[PDB]
């Protein structure tokens, strides 16, 4: 589960696509299987924006890992505030539901849910906004994820999505 490679992310305050960020990251592999088309790289010295789901505050946190997998999966577009993010069906988007920020699959969203969108104006850095969903069908596609320390979410095209955690198990 992940987002598409053209998704724009914050890397230490600069903007780039997540695929560009993956390609720019040195080949320090935590996991590599070319046949399964599955890669995890360690990241050093980079941060991104996230939301603390307990305090509700935006926090800048270290990026620990970046992942790339080529998948054949059902894809959904989340549209909110003139921005959009394309995610796999198995990947969680963050929503404000009943006063709490939680992770939900694109197939399980409610009409009363709101997505969390980055803001360029006003005293608040985020807004909770109505949204639409579009089913893009099944695609064979490179998808990417980052592990964000502590908060396990990140903004893709200004929309908050759940991050993966790679547990460095062994």
Residue numbers in the entry: 0 to 120, 120A, 120B, 120C, 121 to 166
What are the paper's exact sentences on this?
Split inteins catalyze protein trans-splicing by ligating their extein sequences while undergoing self-excision, enabling diverse protein modification applications. The Aes123 PolB1 intein, a representative of the rare cysteine-less split inteins, is of particular interest due to its resistance to oxidative conditions and orthogonality to thiol chemistries. The cysteine-less Aes123 PolB1 intein (in short: Aes intein) found inserted in PolB-type DNA polymerase genes from T4-like bacteriophages of Aeromonas salmonicida shows only about 30% splicing efficiency relative to its PN12. In this work, we identify β-sheet-dominated aggregation of its N-terminal intein fragment as the origin of its low (~30%) splicing efficiency.
